[PDB]
Design a protein around this ligand. Structure first.
Ligand SMILES: [Mg+2]
Ligand SMILES: [Mg+2]
Ligand SMILES: [Mg+2]
Ligand SMILES: [Mg+2]
Ligand SMILES: [Mg+2]
Ligand SMILES: [Mg+2]
Ligand SMILES: [Mg+2]
Ligand SMILES: [Mg+2]
Ligand SMILES: [Mg+2]
Ligand SMILES: [Mg+2]
Ligand SMILES: [Mg+2]
Ligand SMILES: [Mg+2]
Ligand SMILES: [Mg+2]
Ligand SMILES: [Mg+2]
Ligand SMILES: [Mg+2]
Lengths: 134, 144, 60, 184
RNA sequence: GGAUAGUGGCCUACCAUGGUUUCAACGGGUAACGGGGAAUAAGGGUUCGAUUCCGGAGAGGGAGCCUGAGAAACGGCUACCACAUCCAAGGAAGGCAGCAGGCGCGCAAAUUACCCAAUCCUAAUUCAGGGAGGUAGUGACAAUAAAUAACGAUACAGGGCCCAUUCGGGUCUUGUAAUUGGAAUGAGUACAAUGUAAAUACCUUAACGAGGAACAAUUGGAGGGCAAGUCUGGUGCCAGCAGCC
């Protein structure tokens, strides 16, 4: 690009979650769409820790472009980053994968159906099979 | 002493006196008696829907000689009968018979509008297709 | 009075008016430019100031 | 559920619709300042009424009343910052009769025309709404900005816009496109 | 004295004959849940408040009750009343004034969508759940800002000033063009990234995206109140228009 000049503002240390909180102020003249995925490494070698210990979110472009403001988090190590960052933000970075699950409508069906059954239901399963024969 | 009491402890007389004379007003009369609820064929509403029964040849009041081409409509929600005017040049042809029409007042707030005697409602929609749009041939009346 | 009459002659003149259609004319500006146009003909123009600054006097 | 969103109206229509002494005056204000509606004048007069209402309520109070001085200073300063009020008239008695077009002439509509580079108010209205303006470092396309006497020297063409460089222009780009292919 | 968790005619036995009322009792109506508030107001006022917050009541109408700290609970139970579903006629199962949706009623009001990421709540609990809530869809109920065009050169129509050399140029204006040109960009498509739980849009931005026959602003009115026709054609107290005249 040209004059990316990533800047961090209002930096406050958060040792409660072993993290540094700061506002990612981006100046990108003649550029747009600063591609927060690329904000991770440029914020990594600034703090020198690693690329997978930094998370970026927010980044609403100002009126007319050429400037962006968002929020950034950098962790001491990836161990606490995986244990603190939300699961939704991790899958964006590729750290975790989508957990396969039926739609919210379908889960409600299964819970309601399973309420009609008392016990495991194996005894009922053979009983209806025995009854269905005759 | 100008009539009305002036005593500092005569607010009871003044408030009760004002209550008794407030009845000589017409809006305060209709509002508290709820006449529009009990009378005035609508239910205090501005529009009503009904079925056309026939066409009328009402003649003009003085000084005026003309036929006004109104329609008798029986309302849906209460079954009352009213007479309603069909305003435009030749719009009696779109309201032929048994159609389900929407009616509105004339802006006189409950009385007859012009030299049309005893008519205090007008047709605003026939078959729910906005009669005004028919006169300007913008829409088409439904076939049924 | 009477409630009967001649209902067979409703719409006499409207259906009798000869059909003259709208002539094609250039579009007028919309919005601000119209206020620009109207300001010009009224204040900085003296076209019709015959006796009383009429706006649309009849042709005479 | 959630708290309601507060909204307010910012204009008021005159009581008499058709009065010639005001009808032509309205077209005067919209005439040489490029306004598309009477609501621009209607809007301006609304807080002009609100300013006078606040000022009238201040003069009724006794002199040296802390409330008279506090919101008196705030009102007198806030209009001076906008610039609709001159520095000399800082007595709270000249704010009552300021003018009806004093607010209007402080708009970005006029400032672009005042400080050259527009050569007509009707050209400027396009220029602001065409997104070639930087009142500060930021692009603005709202003709009613009410410049604050701290940014009048800061109006300039936006860097990411023609007439300010960094691009030739959109339609000019395809204009030379035929020129290049025709020469071949 | 019984009962209640308690005071108390709350109930019981006995006793006394009291208690409220023209300063409007009692009774009747309310298209009456009450307030915080809303509309309009020089000042005094008038009208409204089903409804984002507080308090109260209700779960079709009543009554009764279990459990539980807390319910006379209704997405808890029992009975009657009114509705009402399925049955191989022996029986069984019900309360959407929760979210969508349907039928009715009407002048009158939207999706049988997505999600627990945000707000917060519940549980044995960091994890599960939550039509509470949030997101998106319909939505001209109301509000805010704000496009639909801007600028040149040629042809007409004006007032001073250079000359004071017939009325010659007019250097300067402000508009009039079935004259011509460059520019400017947005609605609309869109690689992309941004956004988001995942998305759609907004803000950015490659690229594509104005010259009129185009990318075309309507709604009303023109005798007066109330600016705006003594124009043309039709009608001929008819049609019609006309809040009032
Ligand atoms: Mg007295
Ligand atoms: Mg006792
Ligand atoms: Mg006792
Ligand atoms: Mg009620
Ligand atoms: Mg409540
Ligand atoms: Mg209850
Ligand atoms: Mg019900
Ligand atoms: Mg109950
Ligand atoms: Mg229920
Ligand atoms: Mg429902
Ligand atoms: Mg019109
Ligand atoms: Mg008229
Ligand atoms: Mg006409
Ligand atoms: Mg007039
Ligand atoms: Mg007409």
């Amino acid at each position: 690009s040209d004059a990316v000049t990533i800047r961090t503002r209002k930096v406050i240390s958060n040792p409660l979650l072993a993290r540094k909180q700061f506002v990612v102020d981006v100046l990108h003249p003649n550029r747009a769409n600063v591609s927060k995925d690329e904000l991770r490494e440029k914020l990594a070698e600034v703090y020198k820790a690693e690329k997978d210990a930094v998370s970026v979110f927010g980044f609403r472009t100002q009126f007319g472009g050429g400037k962006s403001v968002g929020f950034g988090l950098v962790y001491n190590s990836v161990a606490e980053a995986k244990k603190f960052e939300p699961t939704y933000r991790l899958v964006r970075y590729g750290l975790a994968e989508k957990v396969e699950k039926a739609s919210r409508q379908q889960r409600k069906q299964k819970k309601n159906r399973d309420k009609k059954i008392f016990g495991t239901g194996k005894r009922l399963a053979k009983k209806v099979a025995r009854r269905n024969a005759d | 002493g100008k009539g009305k009491p002036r005593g500092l402890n005569s607010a009871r007389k003044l408030r009760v006196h004002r209550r008794n004379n407030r009845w000589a007003e017409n809006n305060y009369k209709k509002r508290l008696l709820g006449t529009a609820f009990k009378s005035s064929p609508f239910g205090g509403s501005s529009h009503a829907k009904g079925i056309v029964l026939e066409k009328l040849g009402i003649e003009s009041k003085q000084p005026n000689s003309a036929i006004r081409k109104c329609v008798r409509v029986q309302l849906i929600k209460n079954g009352k009968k009213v007479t309603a005017f069909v305003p435009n040049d030749g719009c009696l042809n779109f309201v032929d018979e048994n159609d389900e029409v929407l009616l509105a007042g004339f802006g006189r707030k409950g009385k007859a509008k012009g030299d049309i005697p005893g008519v205090r409602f007008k047709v605003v929609k026939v078959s729910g297709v906005s009669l005004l749009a028919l006169w300007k041939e913008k829409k088409e009346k439904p076939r049924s | 009075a009477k409630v009967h009459g001649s209902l067979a002659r409703a719409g006499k003149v409207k259906s009798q008016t000869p059909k003259v259609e709208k002539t094609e004319k250039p579009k007028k500006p919309k919005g601000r430019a119209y206020k620009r146009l109207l300001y010009t003909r009224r204040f900085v123009n003296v076209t019709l100031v015959n006796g009383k600054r009429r706006m649309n006097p009849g042709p005479s | 559920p959630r708290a309601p969103r507060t909204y307010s109206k910012t204009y008021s229509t005159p009581k008499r619709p058709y009065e010639s002494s005001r009808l032509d005056a309205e077209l005067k204000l919209a005439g040489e300042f490029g306004l598309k509606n009477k609501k621009e004048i209607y809007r301006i007069s609304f807080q002009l009424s609100k300013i006078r209402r606040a000022a009238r309520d201040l003069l009724t109070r006794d002199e040296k009343d802390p409330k008279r001085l506090f919101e008196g200073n705030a009102l007198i300063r806030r209009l001076v910052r906008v610039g609709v009020l001159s520095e000399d008239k800082k007595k709270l008695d000249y704010v009552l009769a300021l003018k009806v077009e004093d607010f209007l002439e402080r708009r970005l509509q006029t400032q672009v025309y005042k400080l050259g580079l527009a050569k007509s108010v009707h050209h400027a209205r396009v220029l602001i709404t065409q997104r070639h303006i930087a009142v500060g470092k930021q692009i603005v396309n709202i003709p009613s900005f009410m410049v604050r006497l701290d940014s009048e020297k800061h109006i300039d063409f936006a860097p990411t816009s023609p007439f300010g460089g960094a691009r030739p222009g959109r339609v000019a780009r395809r204009n030379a496109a035929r020129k290049a292919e025709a020469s071949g």
